[model samples]
Target: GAMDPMIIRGIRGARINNEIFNLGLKFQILNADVVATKKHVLHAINQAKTKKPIAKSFWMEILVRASGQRQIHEAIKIIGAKDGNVCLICEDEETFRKIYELIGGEIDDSVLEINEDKERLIREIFKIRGFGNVVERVLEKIALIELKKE
Candidate 1:
C-alpha cells in the first residue's frame, strides 16, 4: 500500500475536515524535508501493515514518526502550518483528491526540497552534533521509536 506525497500551501479554516469529527479521512501533514518526511511516512506505513502501530490511529502514527518525538504534544510542533507550505502524506488517491478539493491550495512540490535553513533546524531540533547524514539521523530517530517500545 503505497502513499502519495503532496506539497500544498495556504491551507486555512480548519474544523471543516475534522479528524476528531470522524470525517473518515486519514492523512498526515508534516513540516519537514521531503526525504525525511517520506521516510517517516514509509515507516508508519510499515508499522500499519504489520499491525503494530505506535499510536492508536494510523494518521497519528505517521505524525509521531515524522515528528521523531514520542509524545504527541511534542510532536505537535512538527505539524504543518495553516498558512505555509505543508507536506501531506495521503493513504490513497481518493483521499488525496478529497483533501485537495477541501483545502483548495496551491500544489508546489518544490517547496518540500531541503535547504540550509532546514538542515540547520533539523540539526538543532534533533540535537544532532556536527555534520554527516542529517537525514540518516532522522531515520535513526524513526527506527528508535520501535526500539523504544521493545
Candidate 2:
C-alpha cells in the first residue's frame, strides 16, 4: 500500500500529495536546470543598468521566469498542452543551454566552464535577444565582477 510505512514515501508520493494543497497548485515546480538558469541570471543582474535598485531588463527576465509565461511548456499549458515538454520554435525541447547561443550569460553549457571569449559572446548575444523587450541601455558589457565568488 502507498500509505504503508514499509513501502516508503518518496518524492513522487510527496509531490502527488502536494497537489492536494492549494499552495502546491500555485507554487512553481522548477527543475534543477531552471534553478541554475535563475541563479546565473541573478548573478548577472548586477551587471545590467539599474533603476530603483533593480536592473530594468533583469526585472523582465525575472518576470518571464516568475510569470512562467516565457517557457513553451508552461505557455502552451495555458492553451491546454497535455504532452511532454517540446519547443514551439523547433522540435528540440526548450532548455537553458540554447539561451547561451543567443545571449551573454556567464554560465556555460557544463554550468562550470568559463572563458573570456565565451563570456564576451554571451554578453553581446544575450543582450541583443532581449533588446526588443527591454528598454535601451538595460544591458551593458558582461562584467568580470560576476566571476567573483567566495
Candidate 3:
C-alpha cells in the first residue's frame, strides 16, 4: 500500500532526528565517530530547521530514552550480579536477600521469585517507542516546501 505523504515525511524526519541526536551525544562524549557523524547530522538538523521545534523535541526524547536505557541496563547488571548470574527470573535465597536489601524491603523468597527487572525494561521500551511514534506523528503535520525534499 502507498504510504501517506505525512507518514512518509514523519518517518523520514524522525529517522534523521534520531540519528542526529545519537551522533550529537556521541560527540559530546568524545566518541571518535562524532567528528564525522556529528558534522553530518548537525547539517541535517539545521537543514531540517523548517521543522525545528518538533525535530528538536524528537531528538531530545531520543537522547533521553537512550540515556535512561543505559542506566536501566546498569541497574540490571548490579541486581543480576547479586544473584551470582544474570538470571532475571532467579528465585534463589541469596538473590531474594540482595533484592530485598536493594529495595529496602522485608526479605522473603515469595517476593523475589519473579524478575521485575525484565518487566520494567519492557515497560520502558514501550514508553520510548511511544515517544518516538508521537514525534513521527508531529513531524507529519509540519508543512514542507519542495526545496526540502531530497
Candidate 4:
C-alpha cells in the first residue's frame, strides 16, 4: 500500500535501520542545539524499539548537522585562540587545511555576512595563551555521527 507522506510513512515492512534514518532527518530539521538534539535523538531511538522498520532518516540527518556544528565550533576556537592569528607550528597550515576541508572549505571572508559576536569571540579566544590546548581537548571529546554503516 502507498503510504501517506504526512503520516510517518516508513514504519512498516521497512528495514529497522532505515526507520532510524527517517526519524533522524525529521528531528535535525526541528532542532539546532546540540544538547537538545542529543536528548531528542536518544529518546527517539529508545521509543522506536517497539516499532518495526520505521524510517529514521530524519534522526540521522539531525545527528549529522549537530555533529558538524560542534566540529565547526571547535575548529573556530582552535583558529582564534592565539596571538596575531599565527599558527604555533609551521605544520599548523596543514592542520588548518584539514579543518577547512572538514568544514567544506567555504570560507566566507566578508565581514558583513558573518555573525559579529561569534567572530569576535573566536578572535578573542584564540588569543589567550592556553586556548589551543582547550580547543584540542574539546575536539577530542566530540563524538562523530555514525551514519548507516550497519
Candidate 5:
C-alpha cells in the first residue's frame, strides 16, 4: 500500500555502507556532548564560537539576535533603513547555516578555525580609508586550508 521506505531515493539508492553510516551517526547523535565521535554537538559549537570570539560589538549583536527573549525590530519599531534589512540578513543567515551544515556542523573545529580567521581578514581590509568586505574570503580559504589536510 505505502511506497517503499528502504529506498531513500529514485535510482542510486543509499551511498556507501548504509548500516555502518546509520549506526555511527545514530550513536554520534546520542552522545551529543562527547568530542570526536559526538555528532551535532551544540555545546562544542558554543565553545568554538567563544574561542573564535567575534568583536565585542559584533558578538553582542549575535547574542541579542540569538536570544528569543530579547526584543526584536518590530518590538522596538525596527524599520528598514532602506528596505527589509532584517529579512535580507535573515535570509543570508539561513543560507549560511545550511552551508555550514553541508560542510559539517558548526562545531567542526576546522570550521571554527576558518571563521576565526575570517574576522581578522575582514577587519584588516575594513581599516583602509575606503574598503568594504565580507566573509567570502574566509569561505574560499576554508577549502584551501582543509584540502591539504583532508
Candidate 6:
C-alpha cells in the first residue's frame, strides 16, 4: 500500500479506460483543486488506514476524504475533476508507470502547485470562509468528516 502522485493534462474528467480499471489497481483520480498537494492525498490515505472510510472502496475513500465530504455523490460533484489538468494517484510505482504509458498524456505536475487562484478556487468550492491557509481549512474539513460522526 503506497501512494504515488501524478499530474496529467488532456484527460476528460477522472474516467479511466476500462482496461486500466480491469487491472484492479487501487488509485484515485481527482481534480487538481480537489487535492492541491501531496499532503491532501497523504491525509486521505492515512485516514483510510487509521479509520473506516465513509465509502466502502479505498479509491472512493480517497475521493471522499480529498473532497472533504461524506456523500459519494456530493464528493464527486464537488471535486469530480471535470477537465483540464487532473491528478492521478496510484498505490504503487508500477501502477503509475503502467498507467502513464496507457493513458498517454502530457505529464504536468503543475496541478499540485499552490497559488492564489488555486487557493481562491479551493475556498469557493469547499465553502471555506475566513482567514488562514486554504489547505489548513481543507485539512480541517477532511479531519472533521470523522469527528462529525461522534
Residue 130 accuracy (lDDT) in model 3? 28
| Candidate 4 lDDT tens digits, 19-86 | 32232222211211112212222333332332323243433322222222223334333321221112
Instruction: Name the weakest run of 10 consecutive residues (lDDT summed) in model 1.
Output: 7-16
**Which of the two candidates, 1 or 5, achieves a greater lDDT against the reference?**
1
Tell me the spans in candidate 1 whose CA falls farther than 4 Å from its real position: 1-22, 32-37, 47-54, 145-150
lDDT of 3 by residue, 16-88 (tens): 1123223222111111111111222232233333343232343232222212212333422322122211111
Instruction: Give the TM-scores of the predictions, in the order they appear.
Output: 0.67, 0.21, 0.17, 0.18, 0.15, 0.77
Write down the lDDT that model 3 would get.
Answer: 0.24
RMSD of 5: 18.2
**Top candidate by TM-score:** 6
Candidate 2's C-alpha lDDT? 0.25
Worst 10 residues of 5 by lDDT: 5-14
In the range 13-128, model 1's lDDT, one tens digit per residue, is 32224442255676666563433435445655455555454466666665665555455556655553343455666766677667666655666644444456667777665655
* Most lDDT-accurate candidate: 6
lDDT of 6 by residue, 1-150 (tens): 334333232232334454656767766666776555666666676767667745768777767776665656877788754444667777677777776565555665566756677887887777666566665677777678556311
Cα deviation at 1, candidate 5, in Å, is 35
Number of colliding residue pairs in each model: 0, 6, 0, 28, 1, 0
lDDT of 1 at 115: 55
For model 6, give the RMSD to the true fold: 4.4
- Model 3 clash tally? 0
Of 2 and 5, the candidate ahead on TM-score is 2
Q: Sort the predicted structures by TM-score, highest score first.
A: 6, 1, 2, 4, 3, 5
lDDT of 6 at 105: 59
lDDT (C-alpha) at residue 113 in model 2:
26
Instruction: Write down the TM-score for model 4.
Output: 0.18
* Total clashes for model 6: 0
